[PDB]
Each structure stands twice: as C-alpha cells, then as structure tokens.
Amino acid sequence: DDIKVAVVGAMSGPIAQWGDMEFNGARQAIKDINAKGGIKGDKLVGVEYDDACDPKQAVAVANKIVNDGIKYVIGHLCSSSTQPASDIYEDEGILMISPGATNPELTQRGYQHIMRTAGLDSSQGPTAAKYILETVKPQRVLIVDDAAFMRMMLKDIITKAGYEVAGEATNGREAVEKYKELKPDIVTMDITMPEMNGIDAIKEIMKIDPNAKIIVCSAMGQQAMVIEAIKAGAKDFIVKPKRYDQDPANQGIVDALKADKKDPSGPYVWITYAAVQSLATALERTGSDEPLALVKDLKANGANTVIGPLNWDEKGDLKG
C-alpha cells in the first residue's frame, strides 16, 4: 500500500547547497501529507538519490529508479541531469516532475510523463549563483546590483567555487564604467529597480563590446522588461520568485523547518514542496496509479501548492 516516490538532486558537488533545499522541502511535504492521512490512508515513502547534478550519475540514478520499480520521480535538480534522465523515465512510463530543470528542450519533445514546477516563462531558475555554477565556467564576474547584501551573497558563493569577482557596480552608469575598466568575462545585473536603468546599461555595454555576456535578474511581473533585455543582447535571465517563506499560510512549514535547524528561505524548498503536493493531489483526485492519468489530471485541473495555484499546459510547462 506504500507509495514510493523517488527524490533526485545534488546531495554532493557544487550544487549541493541547493540540493539541500530540495530534499528539505520534499521531506517536509511527505511528512505533512502523511500526517494528514497520506493518500486516502496510503503512506508516501520518499526514496532519495544523489546525482551530484552530473549527467552520467543522473543516468545511473534513473536506471536505479527503473530497477526499483518506482513510478513517481520528483527531480532532477539541474537541467543537464534531468534531460538524459527524462528519456529513461519517459521510456519506462515513469512520472517525473522536476523542481529545477529550466532548459527549454525538456518539454518540447512530446513526452507525456514529464512535468516541472520551475522555469516559468523561460526563467533559468530562481537564483543566479546556481545558474552560474551549473552553466558557465570559472571566469571574471562583474556583479551589478544596488543591494549590497545581494552582492556579498553572490560573491561568496562563486568565489568559493573558483570564480573571480572583477568588480561591483551599484547602478547602470557605474556598470558601464566598470565594464570599460575591467572588461569582465561575464556580467550579472539585477534590473529590478528603475534606478538601475538596466536596459539602457545593456545597450551601452553592447556598444562597447558586441560579444558581452550579460545575465540579468528580475522580479515577478517584469516579463516585458526581460524580453527587452534579451533583445538588447543579454544572454539569459533569472526571475527572483516571491518569498514563499513569508507567506503567512506557510508559517507552519517555516516553523517545522526551523525546529529542524533548516533554512526555510531557499526557493527550492518550496518549489520541491509544491512538486510533492502536485503528485499527492493527482493521486488523491484520480485514485489511479497510472502516471499518464496523473499527468493528464494535473494538466486538466491543476493543484494548490505552497507556491500558489499551479497549472500546466499539454507539454508539461507551467502556465499563468
């Protein structure tokens, strides 16, 4: 009667600090769901795997999950690990909901067992630090952000991982002055506040260097400005999500994570929690064990989660 659910992420390697978030949220969601009666009396059982956000290790984990007979997978955490694993899950008829894969090719191959609770509106994750360690090689970074605490947080993460902080800028004017003086290999630029004038700063940098690598960070609702940044020459964009830990409806989970001395501010805590809730919603609403029926139910009816009401299109991507 037990319902085994695989949870796959990075328990080791460079992406480990965000994998800790994923497993913390997944564990708490399974605990909370079982304390509410599980799935009509049936107990959810989490089976945790470590792919180290490595493509080869992720394929071994996917084969291990297939040999275990597990039908539902929450994962993986990184795009380059979730993509080859999703081929195996789709071939074996295994449901897979990823809380971290944001590559576009994941949901553009007609796969009917693949979903995700991340990457809304082509966003490349909630944090720029993880995107940097996962996508780009160690090089000289120019951090452009008005908030000084956001710069020190990003600086500490990439410096420990072998990256170099060439300089820091607080507004769009200084960002151009710093790009002239330092000529960095990559630029991260938060364009949330209007005083930054990020779009104008991108164009001014593009005039100096047409091959500039600029990664922009934005907030919810700034979709139109994000397209202008990419049109101006930006390579990719990060959308900072709403602080779900500050939602008063989520206070009980915040309290539960704090009692375990776990940081509840991480976005992957709630994105992974939402993925578990979505699977539990489909299992309870349909009363079916078939992954295809569960995915079809979620695409038709959605689910209420700790990150808000979720809905998916026919390809498995979030909509709204």
SSE layout:
Layout: E1 3-9, H1 16-35, E2 44-50, H2 55-68, E3 72-74, H3 79-91, E4 95-98, E5 114-116, H4 128-135, E6 140-144, H5 148-160, E7 164-169, H6 172-182, E8 186-190, H7 198-208, E9 214-219, H8 223-232, E10 236-240, H9 251-259, H10 267-286, H11 291-301, E11 303-305, E12 308-310
Parallel strand pairs: 1-2, 1-3, 3-4, 4-5, 6-7, 6-8, 8-9, 9-10
Antiparallel strand pairs: 11-12
Helix pairs in contact: 1-10, 2-3, 6-7, 7-8, 10-11
Q: Count the helices. How many?
A: 11
Order of helices and strands: EHEHEHEEHEHEHEHEHEHHHEE
CATH architecture of the largest domain: 3-Layer(aba) Sandwich
Spatial order of strands in the largest sheet: 2-1-3-4-5
Helical residues, percent: 40-55%
Largest sheet: 5 strands, parallel
Count of distinct strands = 12
Instruction: Give the structural class.
Output: alpha/beta
Q: Note the beta-strand portion.
A: 15-25%
CATH class of the largest domain: Alpha Beta
Q: What does the radius of gyration come to?
A: 20 Å
How many domains make up the 3D coordinates?
A: 2
What's the shape? elongated
Protein name: Leucine-specific-binding protein
InterPro entries: Leu-bd (IPR028081), Leu_Ile_Val-bd (IPR000709), Peripla_BP_I (IPR028082)
Main location: periplasm
GO molecular function, one term: L-leucine binding
